[PDB]
Amino acid sequence: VAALVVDNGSGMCKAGFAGDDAPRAVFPSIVGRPRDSYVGDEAQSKRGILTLKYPIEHGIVTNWDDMEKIWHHTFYNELRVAPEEHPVLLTEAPLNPKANREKMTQIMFETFNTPAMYVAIQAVLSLYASGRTTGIVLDSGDGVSHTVPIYEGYALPHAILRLDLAGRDLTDYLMKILTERGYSFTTTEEREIVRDIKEKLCYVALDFEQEMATAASSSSLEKSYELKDGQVITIGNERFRCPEALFQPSFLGMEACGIHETTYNSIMKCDVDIRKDLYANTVLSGGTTMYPGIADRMQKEITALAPSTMKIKIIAPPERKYSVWIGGSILASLSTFQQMWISKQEYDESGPSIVHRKCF
Numbered sequence: 001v002a003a004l005v006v007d008n009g010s011g012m013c014k015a016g017f018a019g020d021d022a023p024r025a026v027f028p029s030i031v032g033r034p035r036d037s038y039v040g041d042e043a044q045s046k047r048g049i050l051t052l053k054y055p056i057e058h059g060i061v062t063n064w065d066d067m068e069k070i071w072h073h074t075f076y077n078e079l080r081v082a083p084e085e086h087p088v089l090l091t092e093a094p095l096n097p098k099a100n101r102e103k104m105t106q107i108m109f110e111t112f113n114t115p116a117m118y119v120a121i122q123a124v125l126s127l128y129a130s131g132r133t134t135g136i137v138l139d140s141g142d143g144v145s146h147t148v149p150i151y152e153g154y155a156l157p158h159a160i161l162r163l164d165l166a167g168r169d170l171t172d173y174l175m176k177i178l179t180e181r182g183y184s185f186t187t188t189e190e191r192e193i194v195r196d197i198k199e200k201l202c203y204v205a206l207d208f209e210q211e212m213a214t215a216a217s218s219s220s221l222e223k224s225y226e227l228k229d230g231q232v233i234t235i236g237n238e239r240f241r242c243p244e245a246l247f248q249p250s251f252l253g254m255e256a257c258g259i260h261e262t263t264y265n266s267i268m269k270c271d272v273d274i275r276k277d278l279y280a281n282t283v284l285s286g287g288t289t290m291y292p293g294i295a296d297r298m299q300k301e302i303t304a305l306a307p308s309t310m311k312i313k314i315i316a317p318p319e320r321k322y323s324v325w326i327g328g329s330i331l332a333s334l335s336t337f338q339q340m341w342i343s344k345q346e347y348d349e350s351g352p353s354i355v356h357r358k359c360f
């Protein structure tokens with residue numbers, strides 16, 4: 001019997017079997033209720049008649065009722081299995097409140113009656129998925145960005161930094177800067193178009209001010225996007241102005257450090273003796289790190305911050321859109337992991353608080 005691996009995100013949930021190289025179920029973290037109860041794709045298409053809920057905000061579960069439905073759906077509808085037959089790996093955000101980890105443990109055992117379970121930190125699993133057990137992860141998804149220094153599988157809590165600027169913010173940004181040049185977006189279908197344009201045509205410029213000058217003197221960086229009806233929207237500097245907001249959050253009116261300085265600042269919060277290993281093992285994870293050019297820009301920017309003698313290395317796995325899950329698929333498949341689960345037996349004995357001592 002293979003374990004189940006469930007990665008729940010602010011925008012998308014990913015689910016499948018430990019031992020597999022990819023999740024079998026990927027669907028929106030949406031729960032909709034009439035203006036009886038809908039979840040996922042189903043819920044996105046019936047949105048005209050539904051009040052849509054997002055139970056995970058910035059990576060943290062804020063609604064446990066809606067969250068319980070997502071997990072129900074995941075097991076019975078998307079994966080078509082039974083929880084009491086399968087050990088379950090769940091993932092959690094870095095710095096997840098102690099109460100949230102307890103409530104999560106309680107729900108699996110008591111609502112779904114799992115035989116065994118575990119909860120792992122999303123960023124740690126992306127590191128594992130790349131072949132490493134020490135390094136720093138930049139995890140940027142739909143809702144939140146984290147910089148997570150990890151030492152031999154342990155995320156260093158004092159050094160983790162959180163930035164609420166990620167994919168949904170960049171889609172809203174692109175809408176806005178496309179609006180300023182003429183276009184108009186009043187419907188939810190039009191937002192989904194902008195999000196597709198973002199994912200297909202945006203990129204990170206190696207030198208922003210130079211790329212801006214390029215864009216102003218010719219149409220060499222222009223690309224067109226063709227709509228189903230046959231109309232086309234043409235995009236120039238908005239291609240790289242949108243993800244520039246990751247490095248300059250001012251563009252969104254945020255008084256915050258860019259993803260480069262956040263990464264640096266986490267490294268500097270760590271012990272001087274491990275920094276060498278962090279600098280050469282900076283791993284990108286998450287959908288918002290998928291922009292072409294992002295690794296070379298991170299490399300450039302961190303080189304400019306770190307000591308001149310330091311080796312800077314940014315690892316950007318091609319499949320990093322799913323690396324959290326894949327990391328989990330690996331862990332949960334390992335033979336040596338097998339006695340690290342929390343058993344139904346251990347739960348009954350100790351309660352929900354056993355999670356703090358078994359999943360550290």
Ligand SMILES: Nc1ncnc2c1ncn2[C@@H]1O[C@H](COP(=O)(O)OP(=O)(O)OP(=O)(O)O)[C@@H](O)[C@H]1O
Pocket residue numbers: 008009010011012013058059140141142143144145166167168195198199200285286287288289290291321
């Ligand atoms: N090719 C791409 N280029 C740029 N952005 C992308 C690309 N593919 C997906 N994204 C963005 O990635 C986000 C989803 O990534 P991911 O599933 O890692 O996030 P999540 O886990 O749902 O959310 P979070 O980690 O913030 O809780 C969406 O905002 C999406 O627009």
Ligand SMILES: [Ca+2]
Pocket residue numbers: 008009010122141286324
């Ligand atoms: Ca995520």
